[PDB]
Amino acid sequence: DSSYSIDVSADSPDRYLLDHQVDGRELFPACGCLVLAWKTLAALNGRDFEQMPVRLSRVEIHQAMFLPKSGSATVTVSVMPRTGEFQVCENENLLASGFVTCPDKDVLETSTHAQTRSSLQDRPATEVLTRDEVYRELILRGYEYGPYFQGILRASVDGQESEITWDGRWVSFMDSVLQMDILARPGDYQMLPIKFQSINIDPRVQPAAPAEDEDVVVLPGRFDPVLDIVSAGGVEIRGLETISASRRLTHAPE
């Protein structure tokens, strides 16, 4: 029960977590639960969560915690020794489950991590979406991200080739990748992730966090539709079975 006490006050580091809004509600991103399970496994094995490759499988998302506007929240993590069956829950309602482990070199399977050249520039503007439009689509669906989670700099019309801005926080990067995945499946219904199949994170191959003056790092990312696998930098998300939701009008009745 390696309890984690997140805080969302003004001066706390996790203020950025309030940027992950879904229809006018500050939902705690599933990427947050994944990172928390990652840290729990790292701690339980006497490792640091910045140099431990990890693989989360059979992951399923049950509920979405509503982050307080200002205050602190508590979320517990309970992993088993052998099977690594984690259980990220808060209070009395379970948030996410699945298995978490630490494999060897055989962790990433996409090869986009090795790639370092972008090549997305010098493409006609008619064939590249900027950040503004890429996130206009998602806000149209219903996900209204703040500046800290707007971690996509450019995308292709095919929605396959894209550029991510790595700036230290892991949750922002993972939600950027998941945003790529959501963008891969067009529509008009507020898609909600429920079940994953494999999320492999390899921090070693990932570029180091920028310093304060080194601005950001531009990381290439690709979405392979054959297996439906989204890989950017050092992460690799796969599966992403989803359900629909009935939206929630943010304003007063028209």
């Binding site: 064939e127 979406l129 689509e137 019309v157 008009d188 629909s244 939206r247 943010t250 028209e254």
Partner: protein, 554 residues
């Protein structure tokens, strides 16, 4: 729009529309639309499959069909139609489908029940239970029923003579396991037409015998089986209905052949009046359902073959577009225009002309065009700045080459905001040529004899700046006022006419890029989907000029 490109379809006038547990599962929200097979998600509604009524020329037919069956008319595929025999009033023919369809599809097509073997039928009270009983007894096997109450046991015993008193159990509690294991000498049944879930599902799985087929009508526990050669069959009739392969034709043949014999016969029915949907669905939820449940759309008539006469039904009007027509979205390549076009294509539009100034400029427009064309629609993007007769003539020529013209949704705008004290003639001309010249030319060209009888959706998007005013934006105001007055004149003179005054659309517009919270005159920037729903209501209501605004927390 009754003509379907795929296969040949027949439009049947429903008389008695059945209701199944699937319809409740969909209406309640347990089963999401997207979970339905491709081909039923794009459909109009999603409720009701069985139906029975007169086909074209009147010959009484019955059968399953696409989802929009619980309706006053259904476009069946001509392959899902059985002729109603004599001595079978339509009140009774509505019970054979789904019930006997699933019975046969489970026991015969997949179960492959043979003379012998033991069939455990859960919930023998429900219509599927009785159909499975009839089929199983036709094959001659020993049937272990699991009725819930005691009245069901008596009713079934009085409906089937050969059934003994040792072939019944209690489904409510986990007692059927003991009875089945004791009466069958511990071997276990072979074909378990299960319909329960939870612990009862585990108990049912622990009864299956070697080479046993578990026909799950509603699996995790089953995988950990210890009976070696077995089989688990998930039976979802929706998928079969959607994908009418050879198996569907074989099933149709089986049910028809059974009907020719005395095997299949109508079950207990509870006719419910038309305006009782809420009560019908609530009762279906309760579990006290009396056998089958139907809805009486129309009373049957004496003659066994006749035209279905005429009748009018009360219903909230929706907005749908003719797939064989063509609609022009002038300035539809902007922010609003693209989303309006996507909504249109969802509602049935297949031929579009997205007109713009310079054509495709950014990548978002290209992505939207690719997506819309992926939905199966014809989008002929032009770049015709409508300012003279020739330009509008070319636009209409493109539209007609696509197909007969039906509607014109003018969405163009020009924002030369400036106080009247410092307003230039060039700004006024540039702003009015986007609304006044284009609107006048389109009106003049759409009321010509060749297009008037085919046009029904002349629409002009305006803004409240003509109703509530905006500081220093008089060009927009004059344009919007002219458009509203033109639409009022149109409605007074006949023909369609409409002018929707918006307050502020969020997301797509520049306000959305800067942030969809900025307040203007206290009008919060309205969402999109809510804007689309308001547009859906507005398109199908007889009022010339309307408005819609969202107020901001003061």
């Amino acid at each position: 729009a009754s003509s379907e490109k795929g296969q040949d379809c027949e439009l049947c006038t429903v008389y008695m529309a059945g209701v199944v547990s699937r319809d409740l599962a969909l209406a309640c929200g347990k089963l999401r639309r997207d979970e339905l097979p491709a081909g039923m998600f794009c459909k109009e509604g999603t409720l009701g499959i069985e139906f029975s009524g007169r086909d074209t020329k009147g010959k009484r037919v019955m059968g399953l069909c696409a989802p929009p069956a619980l309706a006053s008319s259904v476009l069946c595929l001509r392959s899902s139609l059985w002729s109603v025999p004599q001595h079978w009033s339509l009140e009774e023919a509505a019970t054979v489908p789904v019930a006997y369809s699933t019975a046969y599809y489970a026991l015969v097509i997949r179960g492959h029940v043979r003379p012998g073997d033991t069939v455990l039928v859960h919930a023998g009270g429900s219509p599927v239970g009785q159909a499975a009983i009839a089929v199983a007894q036709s094959c001659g096997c020993e049937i272990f029923i699991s009725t819930a109450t005691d009245a069901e046991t008596s009713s079934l015993k009085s409906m089937f003579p050969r059934l003994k008193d040792r072939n019944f159990c209690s489904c409510k509690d986990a007692s059927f396991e003991r009875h089945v294991k004791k009466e069958t000498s511990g071997k276990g049944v072979d074909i378990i037409l299960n319909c329960t879930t939870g612990e009862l599902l585990g108990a049912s799985i622990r009864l299956l015998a070697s080479r046993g087929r578990f026909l799950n009508l509603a699996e995790l526990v089953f995988s950990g089986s210890g009976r070696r050669d077995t089989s688990f069959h998930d039976i979802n009739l929706d998928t079969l209905i959607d994908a009418q392969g050879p198996e569907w034709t074989e099933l149709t043949s089986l049910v028809q052949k059974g009907i020719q014999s005395g095997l299949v016969k109508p079950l207990a029915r509870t006719v419910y009046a038309m305006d009782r949907l809420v009560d019908v669905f609530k009762l279906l939820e309760e579990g006290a359902q009396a056998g089958k449940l139907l809805v009486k759309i129309r009373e049957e008539e004496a003659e066994k073959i006749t035209l279905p006469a005429k009748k009018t039904f009360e219903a909230v009007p929706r907005t749908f577009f003719h797939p064989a027509k063509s609609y022009v979205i002038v300035g539809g390549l902007g922010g609003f225009g693209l989303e309006l076009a996507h909504w249109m294509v969802l509602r049935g539009v297949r031929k579009l002309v997205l007109t713009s100034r310079n054509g495709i400029t950014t990548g978002y427009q290209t992505r939207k065009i690719a997506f819309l064309r992926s939905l199966g629609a014809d989008i002929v993007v032009c770049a015709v700045n409508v300012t003279s007769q020739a330009a509008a003539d070319r636009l209409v020529k493109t539209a007609t080459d696509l197909g007969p013209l039906g509607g014109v949704f003018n969405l163009g705008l020009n924002l030369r905001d400036a106080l009247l004290v410092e307003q230039t003639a060039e700004n006024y001309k540039q702003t009015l040529e986007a609304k006044i010249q284009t609107t006048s030319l389109l009106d003049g060209i759409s009321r010509s004899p060749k297009i008037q009888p085919t046009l029904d959706h002349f629409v002009m998007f305006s803004s409240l700046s003509a109703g509530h005013g905006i500081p220093g934006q008089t060009n927009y105001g004059w344009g919007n006022s002219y458009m509203d007055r033109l639409c009022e004149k149109r409605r007074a003179q006949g023909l369609p006419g409409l002018s929707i005054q918006w307050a502020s659309i969020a997301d797509v517009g520049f306000v959305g890029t800067k942030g969809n919270n900025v307040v203007i005159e206290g009008k919060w920037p309205q969402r999109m989907y809510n804007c689309l729903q308001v547009c859906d209501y507005f398109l199908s209501q007889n009022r010339p000029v309307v408005a819609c605004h969202v107020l901001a927390e003061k």
